Amino acid sequence: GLKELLKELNKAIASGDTETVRRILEELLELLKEAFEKGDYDLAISIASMAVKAASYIGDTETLKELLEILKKIKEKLKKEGDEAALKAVERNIKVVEKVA
Amino acid sequence: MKFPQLCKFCDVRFSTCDNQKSCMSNCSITSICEKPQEVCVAVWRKNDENITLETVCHDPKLPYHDFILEDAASPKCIMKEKKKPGETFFMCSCSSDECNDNIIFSEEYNT
């Protein structure tokens, strides 16, 4: 499902289809909340990467700020966990978002 | 200002990829790259029976494992062999999102 959403997201970005982007962003945010609440942090980071791109494209600063907040929560958890690639990824995503939120 | 690539970024992981035309990375972490110029990279290594797959972002201005990135502009991760004593080593770089999730050793052809 997520591979197809990414494909559709990029098709829409490339073609200027802002309505599709906004729809996909809404779906990603729902998927993100579910992954986060299940403690599936690798999946949450992954979804968040995509959501950040979609929210950036449509200029949705409020969503970017929400994504920064959830990423910071993920970081707080992973600081304690010893999965270095996941911790580095959440931190990398935070630095990218901080440019736009 | 360019939004960075999204790449698989699990660093070095054990892998089951062997004797296959293509492999999925089985990396559960898609990260945004830090820097806009970075591309996705996959490195497949087999030393005796130990197979690893490395997934990262990397700036193609720089070598990686002391090799120059080839056709980093391609959207697809086309694996190519490098000379490395004592092991089999293949690498690819690519510039489309999650492109280092789909590692290509050979294509399928309609005949």
Numbering used by the authors:
A (entry chain A): 23 to 123
B (entry chain B): 45 to 155
How do the authors describe this structure?
Here we describe the development of helical concave scaffolds tailored to the convex target sites typically involved in immune receptor interactions. We employed these scaffolds to design proteins that bind to TGFβRII, CTLA-4, and PD-L1, achieving low nanomolar to picomolar affinities and potent biological activity following experimental optimization. We focused on five-helix bundle scaffolds, with three helices forming the concave interface and two providing structural support. We reasoned that a set of concave helical scaffolds with shapes tailored to interact with a wide range of convex Ig fold-containing targets could provide starting points for the design of high-stability and affinity binders to immunotherapy targets.
